Amino acid sequence: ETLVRPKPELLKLLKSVGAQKDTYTMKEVLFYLGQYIMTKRLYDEKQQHIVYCSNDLLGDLFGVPSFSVKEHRKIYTMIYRNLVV
Amino acid sequence: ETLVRPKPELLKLLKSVGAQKDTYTMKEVLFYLGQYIMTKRLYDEKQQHIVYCSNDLLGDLFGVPSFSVKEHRKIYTMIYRNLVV
Amino acid sequence: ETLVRPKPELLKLLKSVGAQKDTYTMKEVLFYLGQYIMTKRLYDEKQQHIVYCSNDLLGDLFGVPSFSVKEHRKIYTMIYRNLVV
Ligand SMILES: CCOc1cc(OC)ccc1C1=N[C@@H](c2ccc(Br)cc2)[C@@H](c2ccc(Br)cc2)N1C(=O)N1CCN(CCO)CC1
Ligand SMILES: CCOc1cc(OC)ccc1C1=N[C@@H](c2ccc(Br)cc2)[C@@H](c2ccc(Br)cc2)N1C(=O)N1CCN(CCO)CC1
Ligand SMILES: CCOc1cc(OC)ccc1C1=N[C@@H](c2ccc(Br)cc2)[C@@H](c2ccc(Br)cc2)N1C(=O)N1CCN(CCO)CC1
Ligand SMILES: CCOc1cc(OC)ccc1C1=N[C@@H](c2ccc(Br)cc2)[C@@H](c2ccc(Br)cc2)N1C(=O)N1CCN(CCO)CC1
Ligand SMILES: CCOc1cc(OC)ccc1C1=N[C@@H](c2ccc(Br)cc2)[C@@H](c2ccc(Br)cc2)N1C(=O)N1CCN(CCO)CC1
């Protein structure tokens, strides 16, 4: 049980999909992020592993137009930058 | 910020010297244990780096009668078992 | 409470971390030196117990490129060379 504290904007994001805490485990962070992408359909209708986030609050936070769910380190890094760490 | 959550006993120990939260960074955890040990003089006054936790809550929580503050890995481990981690 | 007087060099250093006295108590100093090192990020990233001070005033004061926080007398010996009396 290793918790993290998301910054104001990220916490706003997680909370838009049901999150209710201030600190979370990374597992929870990724879960909520996953749900958010799926819910707002930021993934490519054709190939679901490609995420197109430009034009969304998510794009702002990750600072990239798109990314692959395979790029784990890149993903951990983009989340990192959004952590009161 | 990387937070951990102390089990009830460790949490009493921590709060017995001033702690006021439920989750802490390991830096804050070790800071407090430091104070607890100093405030109760569990350290050997003839070798200040040796800690004798025998017959003390810290001893029941760490499962050792003594240890050196130089055994970092050992200390992180004894602390791990007292974490809802 | 045995107050101590840090030479000009070291005295100026402690100050940089928000210290306000010409004399302190070892417990106070070490706490600050620890703060200096940490936030200054002078420790090996995969072994926080290793301190790389070269390329820093601290290395000057101690006269060492690096050292381990486990080297206790050495850290005392080094601070005793930075103290009046
Ligand atoms: C948004 C679509 O994401 C996927 C697409 C895939 O296409 C084949 C396969 C796996 C995923 C997927 N992997 C998950 C994940 C978790 C942590 C890290 Br680090 C990386 C990836 C996790 C995820 C979490 C956060 C972020 Br950011 C990106 C991906 N995650 C998911 O969100 N999904 C939703 C889509 N489905 C399809 C179900 O058949 C699989 C799981
Ligand atoms: C999300 C996966 O994270 C891990 C996976 C690991 O697999 C080898 C090992 C360690 C971690 C881990 N390291 C933590 C961390 C904290 C600060 C910085 Br700077 C860097 C890393 C911290 C972390 C924090 C932010 C980010 Br981004 C990535 C990792 N963090 C975790 O969240 N962990 C470690 C503990 N475990 C379960 C152990 O019983 C869950 C995952
Ligand atoms: C209780 C005895 O404490 C010491 C005695 C020493 O003898 C020379 C040297 C260092 C310490 C000391 N080191 C600190 C520490 C922090 C993290 C890890 Br992991 C290990 C050690 C930290 C500590 C924290 C938690 C735990 Br468990 C053990 C040690 N801690 C302290 O509590 N200190 C700092 C050093 N001095 C200054 C006055 O003599 C005594 C108090
Ligand atoms: C005390 C320092 O610990 C680290 C030092 C590192 O060196 C770079 C890297 C990662 C960590 C680190 N790993 C985390 C962790 C959590 C669960 C498990 Br199971 C294993 C490891 C978790 C941890 C939890 C409990 C215990 Br016991 C030991 C480590 N955790 C941390 O405590 N931290 C705090 C310090 N930061 C960087 C601060 O600038 C990194 C993460
Ligand atoms: C800056 C990192 O320092 C450490 C790294 C360690 O790595 C495992 C373990 C213990 C310490 C540590 N020991 C403390 C200390 C106090 C008096 C003397 Br004599 C020697 C050491 C004291 C210190 C004081 C002055 C100087 Br010089 C060097 C170290 N002190 C600290 O500064 N810290 C701060 C960081 N934390 C992380 C815990 O998760 C541990 C304790």
UniProtKB/Swiss-Prot annotation, chains A, B, C:
Provide the free-text tissue specificity comment from this protein's UniProt record.
Ubiquitous. Isoform Mdm2-A, isoform Mdm2-B, isoform Mdm2-C, isoform Mdm2-D, isoform Mdm2-E, isoform Mdm2-F and isoform Mdm2-G are observed in a range of cancers but absent in normal tissues.
**PTM per Swiss-Prot/TrEMBL:** Phosphorylated at multiple sites near the RING domain by ATM upon DNA damage; this promotes its ubiquitination and degradation, preventing p53/TP53 degradation.
The shown range, given as first to last of full length, is 25 to 109 of 491
Family affiliation: Belongs to the MDM2/MDM4 family.
| The organism of origin for this protein | Homo sapiens
User: How does the record describe its quaternary structure?
Assistant: Interacts with p53/TP53, TP73/p73, RBL5 and RP11. Binds specifically to RNA. Can interact with RB1, E1A-associated protein EP300 and the E2F1 transcription factor. Forms a ternary complex with p53/TP53 and WWOX. Interacts with CDKN2AIP, RFWD3, USP7, PYHIN1, and RBBP6. Interacts with ARRB1 and ARRB2. Interacts with PSMA3. Found in a trimeric complex with MDM2, MDM4 and USP2. Interacts with USP2 (via N-terminus and C-terminus). Interacts with MDM4. Part of a complex with MDM2, DAXX, RASSF1 and USP7. Part of a complex with DAXX, MDM2 and USP7. Interacts directly with DAXX and USP7.
Q: Residue ranges of region Necessary for interaction with USP2?
A: 1-85
Subcellular location(s) of the protein: Nucleus, Nucleoplasm; Cytoplasm; Nucleus, Nucleolus; Nucleus
So what does this one do?
A: E3 ubiquitin-protein ligase that mediates ubiquitination of p53/TP53, leading to its degradation by the proteasome. Inhibits p53/TP53- and p73/TP73-mediated cell cycle arrest and apoptosis by binding its transcriptional activation domain. Also acts as a ubiquitin ligase E3 toward itself and ARRB1. Permits the nuclear export of p53/TP53. Promotes proteasome-dependent ubiquitin-independent degradation of retinoblastoma RB1 protein. Inhibits DAXX-mediated apoptosis by inducing its ubiquitination and degradation. Component of the TRIM28/KAP1-MDM2-p53/TP53 complex involved in stabilizing p53/TP53.
Q: Which residues form the SWIB/MDM2 domain?
A: 2-85
Q: What else is known?
A: MDM2 RING finger mutations that failed to ubiquitinate p53 in vitro did not target p53 for degradation when expressed in cells.
Q: What induces it, per record? A: By DNA damage.
Q: What is this protein called?
A: E3 ubiquitin-protein ligase Mdm2
